[PDB]
Ligand binder design. Structure first.
Ligand SMILES: Cc1cc2nc3c(=O)[nH]c(=O)nc-3n(C[C@H](O)[C@H](O)[C@H](O)COP(=O)(O)OP(=O)(O)OC[C@H]3O[C@@H](n4cnc5c(N)ncnc54)[C@H](O)[C@@H]3O)c2cc1C
Ligand SMILES: *[C@@H]1O[C@H](CO)[C@@H](O[C@@H]2O[C@H](CO)[C@@H](O)[C@H](O)[C@H]2NC(C)=O)[C@H](O)[C@H]1NC(C)=O
Ligand SMILES: *[C@@H]1O[C@H](CO)[C@@H](O)[C@H](O)[C@H]1NC(C)=O
Ligand SMILES: *[C@@H]1O[C@H](CO)[C@@H](O)[C@H](O)[C@H]1NC(C)=O
Ligand SMILES: *[C@@H]1O[C@H](CO)[C@@H](O)[C@H](O)[C@H]1NC(C)=O
Ligand SMILES: *[C@@H]1O[C@H](CO)[C@@H](O)[C@H](O)[C@H]1NC(C)=O
Ligand SMILES: *[C@@H]1O[C@H](CO)[C@@H](O)[C@H](O)[C@H]1NC(C)=O
Ligand SMILES: *[C@@H]1O[C@H](CO)[C@@H](O)[C@H](O)[C@H]1NC(C)=O
Length: 518
């Protein structure tokens, strides 16, 4: 298959880039650069590597390097990082939305690709025309291949993923797409950023494609403020190191500051810097640099709804590789060992029953979603104090209708011959399964189930939307030399699993920056 000749193979996680990674305590990192990228995450790492092909780049990341937390480097360690308590330095930062749903974000060089579930997919090909951005579609595809050559494999067979795939097909999630990276209706094996040795590959490895003479990375660099000219332009940043001391770095000439701090971090930093809704910022006595009513608005979290089955015989743990895709729901299942310490946010609250045997977590994702909320500041000065985030799950009735459809399809899945061997009782109904937590239930019972048992899919996005805060080149409207590139930029998903899109986007926008400059 020509289209997959380029995929990565099994290999150790490549930390060669550590040769140009430095502690933010090093004041010799202060000074002038062509580009400053804020946030060494999913988009930020390939963006910085791409810009460094020609220009001097400083990448600033608030977390440390992944070697400090070895359980981020294997598939087997996924649960560990979520189970670990948040001490302010760990790679997983815990939060709770104002809705009451537990959640996490990354705090580590590599961003959320260092802690995530590894599922790799390209964007739904209809996404590009939906946005109305004049994408260079040939370049988009070359850029996917540049990412995939470094960190994406074709997964080997896993017994539970194959069971689930046979079930999806039997339940009518057709056609059978075989192995494919593309987000299309039907059932498929997709790519993974875990290799077939279980080694995690991630966005930090794309730093190895940067020019080591041009790229500098500062870790434990907490960026507190974007600095502006006194024609409004961004000119630099203030960041603090792990000892608390402050540092300043600037861009020069035709260079630019790009914010890649994520759905949560990018609106927070813009607001702290005086870019945002005029009445809101004035009410905090933050001087407004650029009024924009949409900074931190239109923030989205696709709902996750789920059931857990406890088979009467052990099943093998698996990472998610098999996807069942419809336009109105995206479905997967993971199989897991039992645990006595919960992975935080796997279930939506800390008071959720613990599994004492192996279990299958069977999941459906609402597309969009159409419900939205906001990011607002908790502290008007301290970037290390997490902002308030509210998603307003199921405020839009279309989301609820789509959850009902997805839950009914999970019922179909539980009724397949594929899943029958995992029932505890060989009775006709799906009550023959043993359930951890709430089992599946007319639509009123499904609506109640959807509302009561919702969790985060962890695929939140928005807050600095193209068309509201940014133009089609990802520039902050009204401000020269300032862009935003990360998941804050779009109001809908590109697909069921967006890391592949945001990895591509980092390099793609970097190439656009370089081309505009030439
Ligand atoms: C638990 C979990 C599992 C997931 N699993 C999958 C999956 O299997 N497949 C998939 O496709 N997607 C998955 N996702 C979603 C996907 O990984 C994310 O949507 C995507 O990685 C977000 O990229 P980003 O660049 O917007 O943010 P990030 O990758 O989080 O990058 C933002 C970076 O900015 C840093 N930062 C923030 N504020 C500052 C500041 N002030 N100064 C300096 N640095 C700062 C952060 O530390 C972070 O490294 C998962 C998400 C989670 C939470
Ligand atoms: C791929 O993305 C497109 C969005 O651009 C989705 O298609 C739209 O949504 C529904 C599809 O049932 C229709 O009402 C719209 O008319 C569609 N628009 C276009 C231009 O086709 C589509 O559902 C997504 N596909 C998957 C499998 O998620
Ligand atoms: C993976 O192995 C194949 C074997 O055909 C090889 O051609 C390719 O160069 C390897 N991929 C990478 C990214 O090194
Ligand atoms: C940076 O140096 C400080 C000491 O000044 C130390 O406490 C911290 O762990 C270092 N961080 C990294 C990422 O090396
Ligand atoms: C890009 O790749 C996709 C598959 O991911 C393919 O369907 C599409 O035709 C390609 N587009 C271009 C412009 O090559
Ligand atoms: C803002 O400052 C004014 C004084 O100029 C004060 O009256 C007001 O209470 C302040 N508001 C906040 C939220 O600090
Ligand atoms: C800050 O967040 C906490 C939740 O962690 C909340 O209880 C508190 O009211 C918030 N404070 C402000 C000023 O927003
Ligand atoms: C739900 O979302 C759609 C699309 O954004 C919108 O047209 C509709 O008005 C929303 N419904 C409600 C009740 O807000």
């Amino acid at each position: 298959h020509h289209h997959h000749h380029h995929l990565a193979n099994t290999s150790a996680h490549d930390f060669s880039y550590l040769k140009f990674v430095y502690n933010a305590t090093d004041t010799s990192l202060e000074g002038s650069y062509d580009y400053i990228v804020i946030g060494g995450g999913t988009s930020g790492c390939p963006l910085a590597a791409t810009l460094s092909e020609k220009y001097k780049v400083l990448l600033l990341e608030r977390g440390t390097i992944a070697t400090e937390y070895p359980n981020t480097l294997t598939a087997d360690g996924f649960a560990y990082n979520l189970q670990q308590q948040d001490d302010g330095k760990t790679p997983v930062e815990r939060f709770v939305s104002e809705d009451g749903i537990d959640n996490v974000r990354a705090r580590i060089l590599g961003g959320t690709t260092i802690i995530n579930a590894g599922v790799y997919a390209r964007a739904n090909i209809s996404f590009y025309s939906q946005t109305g951005i004049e994408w260079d579609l040939d370049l988009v595809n070359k850029t996917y291949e540049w990412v995939e050559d470094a960190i994406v494999v074709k997964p080997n067979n896993q017994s539970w993923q194959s069971v689930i795939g046979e079930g999806f097909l039997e339940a009518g999630i057709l056609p059978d797409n075989g192995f494919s990276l593309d987000h299309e209706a039907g059932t498929r094996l997709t790519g993974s950023t875990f290799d077939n040795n279980g080694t995690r590959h991630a966005a930090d490895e794309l730093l190895n494609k940067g020019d080591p003479n041009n790229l500098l990375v500062a870790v434990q660099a907490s960026v507190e403020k974007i600095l502006f000219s006194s024609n409004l332009s961004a000119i630099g940043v203030i960041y603090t190191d792990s000892d608390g001391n402050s540092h300043q770095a600037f861009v020069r000439g035709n260079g630019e500051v790009i914010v890649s701090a994520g759905t949560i971090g990018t609106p927070q930093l813009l607001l702290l810097s005086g870019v945002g809704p005029e009445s809101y910022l004035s009410s905090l006595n933050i001087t407004v640099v650029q009024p924009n009513p949409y900074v931190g608005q239109f923030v989205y979290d696709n709902p996750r709804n789920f059931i857990n089955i406890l088979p009467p015989n052990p099943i093998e743990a698996s990472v998610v590789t098999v996807l069942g895709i419809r336009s109105d729901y995206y479905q997967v299942s993971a199989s897991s060992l039992p645990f006595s310490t919960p992975p935080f946010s796997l279930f939506p609250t800390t008071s959720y029953p613990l599994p004492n045997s192996t279990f299958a977590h069977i999941v459906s994702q609402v597309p969009g979603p159409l419900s939205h909320g906001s990011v607002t500041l908790n502290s008007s000065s301290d970037v290390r104090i997490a902002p308030n985030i509210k998603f307003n799950y199921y405020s839009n009735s279309t989301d609820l209708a789509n959850c009902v459809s997805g839950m009914k399809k999970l019922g179909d899945l539980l009724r397949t011959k594929a899943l029958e061997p995992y029932k505890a009782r060989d009775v006709l109904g799906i009550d023959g399964f043993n359930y951890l937590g709430v089992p599946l239930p007319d639509d009123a019972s499904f609506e109640t189930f959807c509302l009561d048992n919702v969790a985060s899919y962890w695929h939140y996005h928005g807050g600095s939307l193209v068309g509201k805060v940014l133009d089609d080149s990802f520039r902050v409207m009204g401000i020269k030399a300032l862009r935003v590139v990360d998941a804050s930029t779009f109001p809908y998903e590109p697909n069921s699993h967006p890391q592949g899109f945001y990895l591509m986007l980092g390099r793609y926008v970097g190439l656009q920056i370089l081309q505009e400059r030439s």
